[PDB]
Write a protein that binds this ligand. Structure first.
Ligand code: 54F
Ligand code: 54F
Lengths: 169, 170
């Protein structure tokens, strides 16, 4: 129904209060790497099968700058990659599928730039490639990560699944 | 290139730029550091005969990322185990005596087919160096696996990390 989500919406999601008990959650701080979803739809995007656009505000005091690395601060590439997986899980919940998310992996990932503590904003762009409903539900997507209008990462074939039991995962 | 195992204190020393020295490869500090010890590192053996690292992370229920990922469904973020793999490829290149600071360059293919729960005892990382490249800058390609208490749970083909004597342009 809704086509954008605020940070307070995402934080509701992290407690289970957006999609409800048993269903997709985002991480809470300090693993949450999205502040807002500025667009989400089941049409458009590079495959015409859905799209998400989300943002993370950067400032110099975010926790990961101090420890990664000392004397050389740079946002962990893995955390920007995670934001993309978490967004694909969110999409699956947003579509109304039951169950909890687990990332299943990726085809090619490329890092070819960085997020410094002087950056203002990271943007994630997700293009849903295919949704699969075979015993369990999953999605395949391509994503990019940009910082202040410059593309810095790409991932082809992000996969995320929903699990109504993770006991055996 | 003569020490073949590293303690947690060696790895914290690396995180401060004090193992390989200033301007050279570092590991993250807590709470981004995802390795407790390197039990084996060599420039021979491994699946390609071109080098190997075996590292460990001890798991207990109080590790920070369990409480926030996720509420009511605690599970070690896959991205952090994947990062460990990249940081170990970085360390390899530092350990080989190359100058410069690490940036991961990506991966060919990543698979998660299990999980680390807060009841787990130990994660092991196995890194098989495939190729080192010296073309103006230096980088390494490697395959890797993440296991928990004996069970393989993640793989990554074609991990790439480079060393950058100037990250300004990156
Ligand atoms: N929804 C979502 C997205 C990314 C990571 C994830 O957690 C994990 C953790 C371990 C194995 C696989 N996925 C869940
Ligand atoms: N040495 C090393 C290993 C893993 C990640 C990394 O950081 C990043 C951060 C942004 C872009 C690329 N690499 C550095």
């Amino acid at each position: 129904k809704q086509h954008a989500f605020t940070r307070e919406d995402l934080l509701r999601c992290s407690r289970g209060e957006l999609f409800g008990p048993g269903n997709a959650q985002l991480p809470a701080p300090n693993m949450l790497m999205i502040d807002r979803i500025v667009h989400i739809s089941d049409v458009g995007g590079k495959y015409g099968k859905g799209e998400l656009v989300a943002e993370l505000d950067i400032n110099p005091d975010l926790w990961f700058f101090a420890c990664h690395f000392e004397g050389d601060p740079v946002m962990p590439g893995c955390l920007g990659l995670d934001a993309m997986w978490q967004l694909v899980g969110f999409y699956l919940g947003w579509q109304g599928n039951p169950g909890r998310g687990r990332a299943l992996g990726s085809g090619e990932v490329k890092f070819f730039g960085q997020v410094l503590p002087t950056a203002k904003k990271v943007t994630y762009n997700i293009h849903i490639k295919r949704t699969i409903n075979r015993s369990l539900v999953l999605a395949i997507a391509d994503g990019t990560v940009s910082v202040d209008g410059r593309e810095i990462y790409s991932a082809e074939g992000l996969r995320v699944g929903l699990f109504t039991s993770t006991d055996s995962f």
